[PDB]
Ligand binder design. Structure first.
Ligand SMILES: O=C(O)/C(S)=C/c1ccccc1Cc1ccc2ccccc2c1
Ligand SMILES: [Zn+2]
Ligand SMILES: [Zn+2]
Length: 219
């Protein structure tokens, strides 16, 4: 069974996918959400922060103590609170907050501090030996949502573009593009034809079937 480590009260939990990849899950307002923790030889890298600065601080502190290294970088996958709500903490700690330009533009528009706006449609990053690819597949859950791919593990972080099995509808679609969303999913499936695991933005880890589930929800 996968190792699962929790904070006091269960508001933050980390679950191990492999030697260097963990999923981090927090309970916001109850609404759980997921991101990743990458344990690299040059520091810890997160995919996404959390709902607010209190949770982001506690996540950072938990992983820095456990893995005995600093969080250096975070990839922000869209400009909603579940993903970006800890940006003030990141900036004041000197943690690099990577994003697309559009995500940064939307964060500013909505009153958050701005991530770097450095990610392109395809960006390849390397942290120690850990390779990370970011990909903008098109509009879907939001205008700006990106996915993150770990090519050494064929793990896809779908983020909120990808719904878990337990999601029975599309959720909050105020900022969504429900026509383009199917094409954007298809763009992910075309880019990454052999996928080991898919981490949705909310709910249980699954596999490619979560992408097919999302397509069905969009009918
Ligand atoms: O669906 C999403 O991924 C997002 S980030 C939606 C969203 C849309 C706009 C503003 C805030 C949110 C967060 C949210 C709000 C209510 C939720 C209920 C159930 C499950 C997840 C939920 C997430
Ligand atoms: Zn969202
Ligand atoms: Zn979300």
């Amino acid at each position: 069974e996968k190792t699962v480590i929790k904070n006091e009260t269960g508001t933050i939990s980390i679950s191990q996918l492999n030697k260097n990849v963990w999923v981090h899950t927090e309970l916001g307002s109850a609404v759980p959400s997921n991101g990743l923790v990458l344990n690299t030889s040059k520091g810890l890298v997160l995919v996404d922060s959390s709902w607010d600065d209190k949770l982001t601080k506690e996540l950072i502190e938990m992983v820095e103590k456990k893995f005995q290294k600093r969080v250096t970088d975070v990839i922000i996958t869209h400009a909603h609170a579940d993903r970006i709500g800890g940006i003030k903490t990141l900036k004041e700690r000197g943690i690099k907050a990577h994003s697309t330009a559009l995500t940064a533009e939307l964060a500013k528009k909505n009153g958050y501090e701005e991530p770097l706006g450095d990610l392109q449609t395809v960006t390849n990053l390397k942290f120690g030996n850990m390779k990370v690819e970011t990909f903008y597949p098109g509009k879907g859950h939001t205008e700006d949502n990106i996915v993150v791919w770990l090519p050494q593990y064929n793990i896809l972080v779908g983020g909120c573009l990808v719904k878990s099995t337990s999601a029975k509808d599309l959720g909050n679609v105020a900022d969504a593009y429900v026509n383009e969303w199917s094409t954007s999913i298809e763009n992910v499936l075309k880019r990454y034809r052999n996928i080991n695991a898919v981490v949705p933005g909310h709910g249980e880890v699954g596999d490619k079937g979560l992408l097919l589930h999302t397509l069905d929800l969009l009918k």
